[PDB]
Structures are given as C-alpha cells and as structure tokens.
C-alpha cells in the first residue's frame, strides 16, 4: 500500500464535508471524512473507489 495511504486524518477544529476520501490503515477501509476531521494533504481521494483503487486493492 502506498505510503501517504497510511496517512491518518488529523481531529482538531474545522468545519468540512467535502466529497472526498481517505484510506483507515486501522481499517483497511476509506472514509468520506467526518466530524471537524481536516481534510489531508495526501490521504485525500476525488472518490472511494479512487482511494480502495490505489490504497485499497486486498
């Protein structure tokens, strides 16, 4: 998997919902973000399928 992958979503202070996802490596998953969850540099997919296509795969 690759690296920026198994990077995780920062939980501080900051309104957002975009349509975007991210890869759980305490999953093995994606999520479309949540709570006042920062959307990440890397670990930021235009859509699921984009982020199980290149980080998921198994």
């Known amino acids: 998997r690759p690296?920026?992958?198994?990077?995780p979503p920062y939980?501080?202070?900051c309104?957002?919902?975009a349509a975007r996802y991210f890869y759980?490596?305490?999953a093995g998953l994606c999520?479309?973000?949540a709570y006042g969850a920062?959307?990440?540099k890397?670990?930021?997919f235009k859509s699921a399928e984009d982020c199980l296509r290149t980080c998921?795969?198994?």
Do not use: P
């Open 3 to 7: 690296d920026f992958c198994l990077e």
């Open 11 to 13: 939980a501080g202070a």
């Open 15 to 17: 309104r957002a919902a």
């Open 24 to 26: 759980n490596a305490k």
């Open 31 to 33: 999520q479309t973000f």
């Open 38 to 40: 920062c959307a990440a």
């Open 42 to 44: 890397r670990n930021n």
């Open 56 to 58: 998921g795969g198994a």
